[PDB]
Amino acid sequence: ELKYKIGFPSLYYPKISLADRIDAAAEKFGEKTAIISAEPKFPSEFPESMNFLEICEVTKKLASGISRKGVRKGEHVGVCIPNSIDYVMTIYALWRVAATPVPINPMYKSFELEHILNDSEATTLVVHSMLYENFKPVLEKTGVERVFVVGGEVNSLSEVMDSGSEDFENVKVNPEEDVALIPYTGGMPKGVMLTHFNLAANALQLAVATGLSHMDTIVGCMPMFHSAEFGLVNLMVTVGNEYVVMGMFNQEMLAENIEKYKGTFSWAVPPALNVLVNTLESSNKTYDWSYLKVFATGAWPVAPALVEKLLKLAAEKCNNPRLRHNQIWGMTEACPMVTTNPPLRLDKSTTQGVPMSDIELKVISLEDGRELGVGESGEIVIRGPNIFKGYWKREKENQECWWYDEKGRKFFRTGDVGFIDEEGFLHFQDRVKPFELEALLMKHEAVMDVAVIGKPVPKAFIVLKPEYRGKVDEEDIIEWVRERISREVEFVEELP
Template sequence: MTDATFDFRAALAANADARPDHPAVICGEDKLSWRQFVARAEKLAGTLADHGVKPGDSVASIALSSVDYAVLWAAVLRLRATMAPLAPSSTPDQIAAMVADSGARFVFVDAPNRAEFGAVLDGKTLVDLDRLDGFIDPTAQAPKLAPLDPQAGFNIIYSSGTTGTPKGIVQSCAMRSLHITGGRRIGYGPDCVTLCSTPLYSNTTLVSFIPTLAWGGTVVLMPKFDTAKWLRLAERHRVTHAMLVPVQYRRLLADPGFDATDLSSLQMKFCTSAPFAAELKAEVLRRMPGGLIEFFGMTEGGVGFMLVAHEHPDKLHTVGQPQPGHEVRIIDEDGNDVPPGTPGEIVGRSPATMNGYRNRPDLTAKAYWIDPTGKEWLRTGDIGRLDEDGFLTLMDRAKDMIISGGFNIYPSDIEAVLLTLPGVVEAAVVGVASEAWGETPVAFVVAREGPLGGDAEALRTAATAKLGKTQRLAALVLVDELPRSHIGKVLKRELRDSFRGTVA
């Protein structure tokens, strides 16, 4: 590796030499030792090279997690090429546009996604990821390893937009290097067994998947999250590390088999990607062994926050402090710093920042705020406030803030009140158009049976008693579940679009 950048590919080869029979990747009954994993990746890399893939090229994938999906990552990076993992939840038009944007000639797909997207990928070479032996040339030899360019693309992560074509976030080898070395400081190492239950096309997964492999541990993959299966896998494989999104924690704790499962091997649990309620953090700390770390940041990078929850039980309402080497400012609409405790937009700087949006210099430029001294700060689009200790309380996305009668209303404040009501399991608040106020808040609630659980108006009345006048709900809608993205984020645009009521 270079002085500044961790060489992921070289690390994999070293792991195969040092611990050839140690398990590298497990998915269901499929399992590869470190020797097998690296050897298969070398053959796939050689085959791709024989087909013309070279350093700097992109290779796309559309698939659920599998052992060979992990092999594909290793093979592409072995060639100093760039991975472009795409979400199968995308529309065919989005898939076609993302593949075109990535520049990938090869697209690796599993059977369901070939059937779903094959028709819109005319002109691309589709390779069946679940029948990889039919593509790999057993005589192929991987080329000599090219020099590592720290600023070369490691991967392209396409943002999960709800409309239009997602933007391609180019993360460099240097940026991933910081994730890897930072992972070592928080427990990833040769003895870790990491259970990845979110998809391999999500940055949420990659910040656990990549450090685990880099340091010679074992990755256990789940193609689809299921609480009973997660518990069985954690117990069977003596899992030490796990990255979960908040809704997964909530569902695991509610599983009837949770308390009977031996989770004593857990050393560290992580969470990111969606709001993590303080009450849920406290329950995780109480009922699940090991420490708990929450991350808050963007796939684009900039400032990242970390809450070491087991060391700061009095700060569970926050997302922690800036990570080492990261800078943060909270600014108002005019770019002025606001005092501690005052909400404002979160902007930040760090070495762990994207190269930019692929093929979109215009959007890349808009992603930054330039202060009066000329320094560039990446905009998060989030509203938050810092306390006197430097811990960040996250309010809302700026676009989700409701302006009602000239007052700023933060949906998270209302959601926190709703979650205190008997029977309320989940809540999301959005702004809808109002002739009287411009916008007004409407709540969507998942509730259990109980004194108030089945009565929307009773819940709204109970919430009104605890809310300020400007926060009062115009309507409350009971739903069976909240719409979520593949990493558990509530899709508030879908909730707004679904509202069919009338408000004053």
């Protein structure tokens, strides 16, 4: 019962290595500035900015060097580097070698690092020197055989590049079968295997849906190790836009960079937008966001009140009375962009929009599994060229998240509940429905049994081995966990 009909056009997706686009981007955009490093910034082994020819050449050399150093096709390579041109150059080089990077959250500590490395069975690690100490304590406990340190004195990127040749040729791949990236889903952690075809397709889908092109300049403030921000970074080599890097989220600097670099687009998760709005609200500064067309939100639904506040402040303090809001919905298993509002209907920016190119979305009944109609809530299921191959080392899960239609077509059960309105727009309602700390605490030699609970701030109830009573206080535990996890336990209470 649709009263309005709108969607995004079917596209053609080429069967290519994600690396071919690096080459193509160099040939099509040449000297156009591809990426620029802005404040705040972490130490880098690259210049402040680079054009497509430089990205092309630098990545060929790094690929050759890393390859000669032992990295092989399909190898799982842990990559832990904060937002920077270095992170991008690393991932791209790995793609030229047809290796499989495993993005690792820079905020992770000992415990988290050991476990994602072991779960993913990474045999190589590229880490920023500033983060190396976090890995050192547990590296020997993993399968990592090779370590490269961005900005290090030993095995740095430039050193690897000096050993590489500029005449490197992309390693051939089966686009639809070979895994190009394994981001871990941030409940029950698991690696999502995304093929070259999946990511190549999501880039085109994303470009066509948002309208982002060679005329745009994207200012990124969200974590690059997350598929969302990186999905935006990867547009560079797809449509030739410019990307502005920020080492970390800093509301004030985000506002300045949008002005300084004449940003045409940016986005943030809701809580970050709230911090930016409050900083604009209390500040006595004036900004020039006259080129900013859209500031989007993602990860989770934003409050309409927050969006209104942004657009008002943008008009009263950012010399931008025409700014529009929009949002993209999706999940890691989808590269991860799925839906967004078409520019023709930005007035529906409070909904999750419609499916991007070639994505088919249905609402499935939680009672009997039948397909539901307009206005009816049920689990959202999706099909498209961007839908993941499956979870890494998770046999069970790989056989429980599927839905097939009458023609044998496979859909992914998102685990999300929602409904489609009369205009065809998606309304995400909710997901269908701590331990890491216990698992951590469980390795402390003095521990016999641990139980962690929330406390309005986590609090742990530990059962010391009789042999340790009085030998370890509630403070020794607090410090111990602090040094091993990002989440840390706040208060500890011991008892029999």
